[PDB]
């Protein structure tokens, strides 16, 4: 699970800061939203709830602050929490 | 007569004072500051609140200094009688930015006035000062979040615990989350204070008709028994002596009050320990914070050795009168010569080590009856 991650993260930053992307950044995003509702069941998967299971299903919230008009402030708290969890 | 005449030389002064540059009258400046101060701390009464407006809006230009700032500040906290309820916006904007920036500035004076103008914030009301409160947000969660660099940052964040006495809708924002990362990174000492007034908060909270506030943070409540002990299961690492720190303050958590971990968070705090107690031998290291609430006596053996484990046992008495004692002890030693066969009989014979772990069914009855759990304190 946390394999993955890695690469969603450095695509889904560096398409926005270089290749001007609008929506296709949450083409890259929803196979990752599309993942977690299956929920955890094991030992590792109970791992990963305490480790980052916390601000993974709030950060589409602040998604959810940034498609009525494209503010700067709704959206960098995410992304305070993406380069947090990258190098953990 | 004299107020009247007094009031209005001062505002001649700050008037003065504000026409002036002020390169060279800096400390004829801090000298008339001073003596206003003086003359305000003598008399409060005369002859408006205007005069407290023209020293809020002057105390802007004062914090150049920053020197004269800290004089100006010790008369807002002497004649706040009403000031800080009628017109609050007016000083939010700038006695929070000058609180945040003098961590910054390296300023002694500067962080004992912001430091006195916040206790004479907290003392006088809560209700009212809310907005006061919800301006210094980043000003209290700035000294939590960069304690690691500076030094003064861990004066300040035990200063504004103490401004949170009700907590009920103050912030709301980020009070519970600032609350659990200073605890992980102070001593014993300074963390079992904290975590028992985050307790009271939290019992108080539940107990008023705010409960839905307080009703999230047993999670917060979780993660510091995860990081000592669920820390481990992905990767073991350490940080021994913040897993020791962290361990004895939820200890003295669980041991002081015990009303959050019952009956809900105690069955799933027991089961995390008992998963990382049967997962390696790094993590099963810390149930002797759990042995030393109630059946203290984990530093009688240093792991040598299994000959003198019953020395330590007969040694940890006094023992004056030891009758009953030695008995037990003696007991307690045929369990463990029991339990050691259990453990040598691997994997054929596993019928002692069944009747090991099914040894509570009797104890299990006769203390719900008769409250008396000696023998298995024992073992």
New interface residues.
Partial sequence: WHEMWHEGLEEASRLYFGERNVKGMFEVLEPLHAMMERGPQTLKETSFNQAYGRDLMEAQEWCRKYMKSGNVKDLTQAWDLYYHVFRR | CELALQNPEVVALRGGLNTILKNVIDCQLSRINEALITTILHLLNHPKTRQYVRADVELERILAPYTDFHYRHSPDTAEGQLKEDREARFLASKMGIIATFRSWAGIINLCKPGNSGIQSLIGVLCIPNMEIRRGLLEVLYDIFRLPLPVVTEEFIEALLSVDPGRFQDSWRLSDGFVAAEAKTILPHRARSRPDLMDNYLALILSAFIRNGLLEGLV?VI??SD?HIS?RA??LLGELLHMANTILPHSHSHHLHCLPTLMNMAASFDIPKEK?LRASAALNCLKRFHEMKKRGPKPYSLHLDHIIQKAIATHQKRDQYLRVQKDIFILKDTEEALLINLRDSQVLQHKENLEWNWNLIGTILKWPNVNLRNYKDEQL
Avoid: A, G, H, L
């Fill in positions: 999670e979780t993660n995860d669920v299961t992905i998963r």
